[PDB]
Amino acid sequence: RPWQMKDLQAIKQEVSQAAPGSPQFMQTIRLAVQQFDPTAKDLQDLLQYLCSSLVASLHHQQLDSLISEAETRGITGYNPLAGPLRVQANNPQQQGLRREYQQLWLAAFAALP
């Protein structure tokens, strides 16, 4: 049950005025992420739709650092012999990795301003 075009259109329109990482944007994006239960691929699509290449790159770097610390510590469900967290989160049998990816994503995007 992935999102459709209308959901993305509403998500972008409702937060057109606000700035990335504002409380309003964080509310709406967090609700979307917690409601649709998407993988990393869909999150990348959503970010490409919402913010430009500059904000995309900044979030990419911040999320790289956050994932770096998180999975360098060692995580309950992460096994580094199978692939990067971006790929484990895309397997529907690793929901723990998917939820960790979602939370790192939202925190990274919130850490912009």
Residue numbers in the entry: 13 to 125
Give sentences copied directly from the paper behind this entry.
The retroviral structural protein Gag forms the immature protein shell of nascent virus particles. All retroviral Gag proteins contain three canonical domains: matrix (MA), capsid (CA), consisting of independently folded N-terminal (CA-NTD) and C-terminal (CA-CTD) domains, and nucleocapsid (NC). During immature virus particle formation, these domains function in membrane binding, viral lattice self-assembly and viral genomic RNA (vgRNA) packaging, respectively. Our results show that HTLV-1 uses a distinct CA-NTD arrangement to form the immature Gag lattice and that, in contrast to other retroviral structures, the CA-NTD is the key determinant of immature HTLV-1 assembly.
To gain insight into the immature architecture of HTLV-1, we used cryo-ET to visualize mammalian cell-derived Gag-based VLPs. The CA layer exhibited a regular organization; hence, we used subtomogram averaging to obtain higher-resolution information for this layer. However, to account for the observed heterogeneity of HTLV-1 Gag VLP shapes, we applied local C2 symmetry during subtomogram averaging. The resulting maps had a CA-CTD layer that was resolved to a lower resolution than the CA-NTD layer, which we predict is because of heterogeneity caused by flexibility of the CA-CTD. In contrast, the CA-NTD did not show increased heterogeneity. Therefore, we used both domains as independent species in a multiparticle refinement using the software M34. This approach yielded 5.9-Å and 6.2-Å resolution maps of the CA-NTD and CA-CTD layers, respectively. The CA-NTD establishes lateral interactions that form two basic building blocks shaping the lattice: a CA-NTD trimer and a CA-NTD hexamer. The trimer is formed by interactions spanning residues in helices 4 and 5. Similarly, the hexamerization interface involves helices 1, 2 and 3 of two neighboring monomers (annotated I and I′ in Fig. 1e,h).
